[model samples]
Target: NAVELTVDNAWFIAETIGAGTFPWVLAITMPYSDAAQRGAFVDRQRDELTRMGLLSPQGVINPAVADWIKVVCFPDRWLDLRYVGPASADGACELLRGIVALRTGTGKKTGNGVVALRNAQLVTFTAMDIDDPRALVPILGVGLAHRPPARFDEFSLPTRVGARADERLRSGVPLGEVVDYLGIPASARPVVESVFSGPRSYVEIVAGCNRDGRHTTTEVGLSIVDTSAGRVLVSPSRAFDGEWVSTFSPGTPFAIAVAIQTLTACLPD
Candidate 1:
């Protein structure tokens, strides 16, 4: 019962497999219908995991992870986020930090992780395969599902979008803190330093399980220009109800650093 892939395979492997090999298993056992179907493949796998009851893009994992995912998936309007599962029962924040550790190696090395939900266990795909680390969901009914990956010095940050606003809003996080929080490697400092030259500041994030209120799940709003000239610095666009920088579900304790890590991950520099 082994899975194999090749151009000249002599046998046909099945379309699906159960969880046994690695913790964060790949989302599928079969190849895409065509070459241009990666995102479509994610959708298919998302649905399949939903069918299996392991993951729920429509649900909240631990509230913390859910909120963090909201920002990474940003807007999350197109269904880019999902509840990947727990690092433990302590709360979603511990698990979320574990994820940050995976993606950033806590500064020891680069972190390239593909997420999967596995009942709060430490899931490492390999001495080779791929990734781990995060929250105990609402207690589900299925298994693990999964990423392609990154290597030692090859962490990949998001450089997809440029500045969002036309002018500055207010101060953001400090440059040094931004560096620590995101776990930026020495390799990418110049760009990041340039990024830090702007101003960032503390946000009164009252989000996640405020029950009393909902605000920034993380604490600071790091501005990368566009919103640089002068305004109120509309921080926390990510919200449960769809606000800007709105990280929903109350995934606090991403506390401060990893919270910024979310934004820095998307940063080009």
Candidate 2:
């Protein structure tokens, strides 16, 4: 673990909140504030990424960022830790540190787990009234980036379909005049057992891929949450929309061309 459970001299990831346009941090985190911590979490996180070859753990091997670090926070706790890995299955910290002068205590677990989505990412750890991360669950297409390995337990997310969508992988929609379209290139159908029975708030939209390039690592990120429920909102910079629905072949589930109109849907020249 990055921060200890008040255990003996233990471990953590360290990073400085950069003073750029909006203060972007690039190192593995878990520091409480601008003080109180170490580079332990960073080293631990780094070694794993490098070992996985996902990231070089570069800073050590010399700034080897798989260009990624996963933040493992909770809706109930206070210490928002980070490390160099895609998932939380790994340990926390390696080098560097920081501190959060607020309460670092965690509360009871809620609804399976705690996860923040779409609007959830913007919340400050100490500011939230949560002791569980699942309290901040995000809607589908709202908080995930680069597609996760499995579906969410707290989210009624996208489900996979039968057969490979090799044909749908082809791009039929033209970027034509677009640099980027903020959206999701994804699909999932009900596989039975009914994860959700009715309309609800705070669910996850996990990925549809089991693994590997089902259609190239297009790096899709997405999140959606209920506004009426008073959920948080994400910054466009922090918001990552996955898959280009505009790019899929005609009938692909991820291909969102089914409901577009002709020139009539546009201006008539």
C-alpha local distance difference test of each model: 0.27, 0.22
Candidate 1 structure, TM-score to reference: 0.18
In the range 233-268, model 1's lDDT, one tens digit per residue, is 122334455434422112222222344445434322
Q: State residue 92's C-alpha deviation in candidate 2, in Å.
A: 23
Question: How much is the lDDT of residue 96 in candidate 1?
Answer: 13
Global lDDT for candidate 1?
Answer: 0.27
RMSD over all Cα atoms, model 2: 19.8
Deviation of model 1 at 30, angstroms:
4.6
- Per-residue alpha-carbon lDDT of candidate 2 for residues 84-127, written as tens digits (9 for 90 to 100): 11223365323212111111234332212212211111221112
Where model 1 places Cα greater than 4 Å from the true spot, the runs are 1-14, 17-235, 238-269
lDDT of 2 at 36: 25
